[PDB]
Amino acid sequence: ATNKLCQSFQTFNICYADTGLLGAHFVCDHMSIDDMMFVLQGQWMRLCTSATESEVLRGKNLLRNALVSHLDGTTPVCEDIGRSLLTYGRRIPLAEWESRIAEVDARVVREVCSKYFYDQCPAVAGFGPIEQLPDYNRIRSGMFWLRF
Amino acid sequence: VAKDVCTFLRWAAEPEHDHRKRMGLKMLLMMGLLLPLVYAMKRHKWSVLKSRKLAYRPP
Numbered sequence: 788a789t790n791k792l793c794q795s796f797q798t799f800n801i802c803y804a805d806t807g808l809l810g811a812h813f814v815c816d817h818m819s820i821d822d823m824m825f826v827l828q829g830q831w832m833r834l835c836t837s838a839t840e841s842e843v844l845r846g847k848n849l850l851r852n853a854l855v856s857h858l859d860g861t862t863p864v865c866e867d868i869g870r871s872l873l874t875y876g877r878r879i880p881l882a883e884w885e886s887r888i889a890e891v892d893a894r895v896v897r898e899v900c901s902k903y904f905y906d907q908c909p910a911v912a913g914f915g916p917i918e919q920l921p922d923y924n925r926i927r928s929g930m931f932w933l934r935f
Numbered sequence: 936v937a938k939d940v941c942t943f944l945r946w947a948a949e950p951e952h953d954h955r956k957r958m959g960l961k962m963l964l965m966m967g968l969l970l971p972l973v974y975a976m977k978r979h980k981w982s983v984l985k986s987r988k989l990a991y992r993p994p
Contacts, residue, residue, distance in 0.1 A: 923983045 792819045792826065802874070808910070809903055817916035824921050828929040835905040836935040838896040846896070847888050854884060906931045 796813035813823050858864050858881075871878045907930055913920045921929070946952060978985075 924980055 790822070791816070792823050796823070796827070810909065817919060820913075820917065820919040821921055824926065824929065828926070831900070831904045831930075832932050834896060835901045836897065836932060838893050838900070840893045843891065843893045843896045847891060851885065851888055855881065904930065 793813045793815035796811060798811045799808065801808040811827055813827070815823050858867055868878055908927060909930065911920075911923065911926060949955075
C-alpha cells in the first residue's frame with residue numbers, strides 16, 4: 788500500500804484430491820513485479836522461520852471470523868453441505884473447525900509453512916507486461932534464507 | 936659423475952622442484968574434482984534456459 792507496489796493481491800490455497808495450489812496472485816505495475824515477488828516471498832520465509840504468537844492469533848481470529856460469516860444464509864450453507872460430503876465425506880461442524888484453529892500456535896505455523904513453502908520449487912504463471920517478472924532461478928532462490 | 940653433478944645442478948637452480956611437483960599432483964586432483972562439480976553447478980542453474988520452449992501466438 789505505502790509503496791504502491793501492486794493494485795491487488797491475494798493468498799489462496801486451492802485444494803484438489805491428493806494435491807493443490809498454495810500461494811498468491813498479484814496484479815501490478817510493470818515496474819513493480821520484482822518488488823512484489825520479493826516482499827511476498829519474504830513473507831513466506833518470515834512465517835516459515837519466525838512467525839510470532841500474536842500474529843498467528845490474528846490469523847486464527849481472521850479464519851474463525853472468515854468461515855463463520857461466510858456461512859450466512861441458505862445458499863452458502865447448502866453448498867458447504869454438498870461439497871463437504873464429496874471432499875471430506877461429512878460436514879465438519881463449526882465447533883470442530885474451532886478446535887483445529889485453537890490447536891494452531893506460532894510453532895505450528897512455522898512447522899506447517901516450512902513443510903510446503905521452505906526450499907520448495909514453485910509453479911509460476913505470468914501474463915501481460917512481464918519483462919520484470921523475476922527469472923525462475925531467482926524466484927527459486929527466493930524460497931530460502933541463508934540464516935535459518 | 937656427469938649424471939650426478941647434473942642432478943645436483945638441477946636442484947641448485949630449482950630447490951622447489953620436489954615441492955612444486957607435490958603441489959602439481961594435489962592441484963591436478965582438486966581440479967579433477969572441482970571442474971566437473973562447478974561444471975555440473977553451471978548446467979544445473981542454466982537448465983531452466985536450456986530446456987525452455989518458445990511460442991509465438993499473434994491474435
